[PDB]
Design a protein around this ligand. Structure first.
Ligand SMILES: *[C@@H]1O[C@H](CO)[C@@H](O)[C@H](O)[C@H]1NC(C)=O
Ligand SMILES: *[C@@H]1O[C@H](CO)[C@@H](O)[C@H](O)[C@H]1NC(C)=O
Ligand SMILES: *[C@@H]1O[C@H](CO)[C@@H](O)[C@H](O)[C@H]1NC(C)=O
Ligand SMILES: *[C@@H]1O[C@H](CO)[C@@H](O)[C@H](O)[C@H]1NC(C)=O
Lengths: 58, 172, 172, 172
């Protein structure tokens, strides 16, 4: 990955002082969710970032 | 209080003194009298009257500056602005604290020195005619009427014409 | 050393003095004795005990600041951050240097003044009974036993009852 | 002028003095003579010779900094750079003003103290043989030839061998 303005995001996340993540109900209609790749191996199989949803065509 | 005059060997202020800052209380045959020394009071007041204009001349004039209050959270640039303002505030607060402490210390030493200088000047006028009793008060060893006392306060005390009588009174 | 007492007319410290900072060494018919003056030592220690809490009250509390170490080279913003930090460091280093120099100078002047104040207080107790030999040591001109000496150190020296004998010894 | 020696009880400088800063003018039967005191002059000069290297050790070395002059108008970043530079300039200007004021005050007090210290040292050499006339000038009460005077200036004045004659001249 790559973070444009990486310093700013790191700074504000550090200042917030928490990684508390509240899952919201997003409704992605007509696309495949939970995309993954073999570069990011979660468990034995392919995976992805746990806080990001890779939407592909359905 | 570097010289030990004020809060030292004087040991007490005079709330009845309203004429000036430093002065004399004399007691002789005629009766007790009190006066203030204008020269020492004026010197101390002159040295105190400024004392803050001589370092911080005045207020400099600032018109357009950075923003110091922010609504959202941007990141690097807001962090830098907050840091710059906090650094400036801390440095100027330290400057204020140190300046006030130094000025207060010097003012106290200055007034103590003026008291000591008045005492020494008076002691030097009374070369051998008087003895310092140690509580900041001189014992003069001859008939010294109000004209004599006002000559002491004036600075024109003629020590030569009382030297014989004073020396006879002291050493018998 | 503004008053010339310490490293001035005293000319020597007393490594055998462990009781206090300032004190007396007396020598009379009975024999040499030594004591320390608690009042002057306590005054100097009290004036020294703080002396840094009165300007820099304490450490202020800083939590989130700018970045001060950088991996890559960005340009304007990194230059500004480096400049701000370098400016703050230089200003605080100067503050530290000047503060320490001023405090050291005042401490030295303060201890010198306390020594001079003790000397002058003692000299004023011995109005005409003693003569200052100039090396910081008084020659008393009468039988002065250990009770006499401890009265001098106490501050209750009764100069009136030795005045005749002392004056006779001095001026013959 | 905390001690009132210079511009105080001395009341006048000596433009004819080129040998040193502090010195003596003696007058006896042989004739008027003048000399300079090397020890006090050297002490004052030594204390003055630095006095600025002891706070600002030297010039620090700055190579690449921010831009301080701008052609166009950008906005936030230019405002921040201008603000940072103006803050640094104001803080350093205040540092310069306060430092120079403090150093000047201490230099004046230092030279006054050296004058007072020389006066007191001389007065302590002449234990009972001389009287302070109050204008910073001692009246010695015995035959004191040029060898006597140079012994006073030397610091080896033998007060014991003139004590009887001096006391007889003073108190008759
Ligand atoms: C994190 O916290 C949120 C709410 O506090 C909760 O819903 C979620 O299950 C938590 N997840 C983990 C891994 O603790
Ligand atoms: C004080 O002295 C001045 C000059 O030395 C003289 O003119 C005056 O009469 C004296 N007495 C006062 C001011 O009471
Ligand atoms: C010292 O003086 C105090 C009061 O002036 C007195 O009580 C004491 O007995 C004296 N002698 C000492 C403390 O040795
Ligand atoms: C001054 O004193 C020193 C030592 O005390 C002596 O050697 C010298 O001869 C004296 N006279 C001078 C330097 O004229």
């Amino acid at each position: 990955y790559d973070v444009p303005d990486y310093a700013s995001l790191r700074s504000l996340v550090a200042s917030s002082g928490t990684l508390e993540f509240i899952t919201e109900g997003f409704t992605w209609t007509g696309v495949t969710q939970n995309g993954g790749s073999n570069a990011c191996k979660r468990g034995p199989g392919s995976g992805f970032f746990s806080r990001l949803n890779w939407l592909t065509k359905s | 209080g570097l010289f030990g005059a004020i809060a030292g060997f004087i040991e007490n202020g005079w709330e009845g003194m309203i004429d000036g800052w430093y002065g004399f209380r004399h007691q002789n045959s005629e009766g007790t009298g009190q006066a203030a020394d204008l020269k020492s009071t004026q010197a101390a007041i002159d040295q105190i009257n400024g004392k803050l204009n001589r370092v911080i001349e005045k207020t400099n004039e600032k018109f357009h500056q950075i923003e110091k209050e922010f609504s959202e959270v941007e990141g690097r640039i807001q962090d830098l602005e907050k840091y710059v303002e906090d650094t400036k505030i801390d440095l100027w607060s330290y400057n204020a604290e140190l300046l006030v402490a130094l000025e207060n210390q010097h003012t106290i030493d200055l007034t103590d020195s003026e008291m000591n200088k008045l005492f020494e000047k008076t002691r030097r006028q009374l070369r051998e005619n008087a003895e310092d009793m140690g509580n900041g008060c001189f014992k003069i060893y001859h008939k010294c009427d109000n004209a004599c006392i006002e000559s002491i306060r004036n600075g024109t005390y003629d020590h030569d014409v009382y030297r014989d009588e004073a020396l006879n009174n002291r050493f018998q």
